């Protein structure tokens, strides 16, 4: 069994921009979600080999996780906040697509998503 390569986190050809919204996503949104008691299943790419989920990457073709998001934020991978917000949304949706409603992993995802959306409501205006 094999995992795919992880999502891209370095590309010197991709133009980059530091923005107050992106700083907010790292400083406030990611940091807050990362420390949450249910963050641990989302802090790295799903290891389908270790977890014995050989169909995972048959079902999930755009994998995403907070470890990848943290790296993208910390090493300034993004141009805008919407790119990052999309990554969070993809992580949550993948979980809801792959797992059954009311699986523990889904309850965890929903808790994080609720917190995520609350923080996104305070996304600062672009300076």
Ligand X SMILES: CCc1c(C(=O)N(C)Cc2cccc(C(N)=O)c2)[nH]c(C)c1C(C)=O
Q: Which residues of the shown chain bind ligand X in the complex (CB under 6 A)?
A: 41-42, 44, 46-47, 50-51, 53, 95, 98-99, 105
* Cβ nearer to ligand X, comparing 45 with 79: 45
Q: How far is the CB of 125 from ligand X (least distance, A)?
A: 32
Phi, psi for residue 55 in degrees, rounded to 5: -90, -5
Question: What is the token pair recorded at 91?
Answer: 């992580």
**Which runs of E-coded beta strand occur in 70-119?**
none
* Cβ nearer to ligand X, comparing 42 with 88: 42
Q: Are 38 and 112 in contact (CB under 8 A)?
A: yes
Residue whose tokens read 């141009």: 79
Q: How far is the CB of 70 from ligand X (least distance, A)?
A: 15
Question: Which residue sits closest to ligand X, CB atoms considered?
Answer: 41
H helix or E strand, kind and range, residue 23: helix 20-24
Q: How far is the CB of 25 from ligand X (least distance, A)?
A: 20
């Amino acid at each position: 069994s094999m995992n795919p390569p992880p999502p891209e986190t370095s590309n010197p050809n991709k133009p980059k921009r530091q923005t107050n919204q992106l700083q907010y996503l790292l400083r406030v949104v990611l940091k807050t979600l990362w420390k949450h008691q249910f963050a641990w299943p989302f802090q790295q790419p799903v290891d389908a080999v270790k977890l014995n989920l050989p169909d995972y990457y048959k079902i999930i073709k755009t994998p995403m996780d907070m470890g990848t998001i943290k790296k993208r934020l910390e090493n300034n991978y993004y141009w805008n906040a919407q790119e990052c917000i999309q990554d969070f949304n993809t992580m949550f949706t993948n979980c809801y697509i792959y797992n059954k409603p009311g699986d523990d992993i889904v309850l965890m995802a929903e808790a994080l998503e609720k917190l995520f959306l609350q923080k996104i409501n305070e996304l600062p205006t672009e300076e």
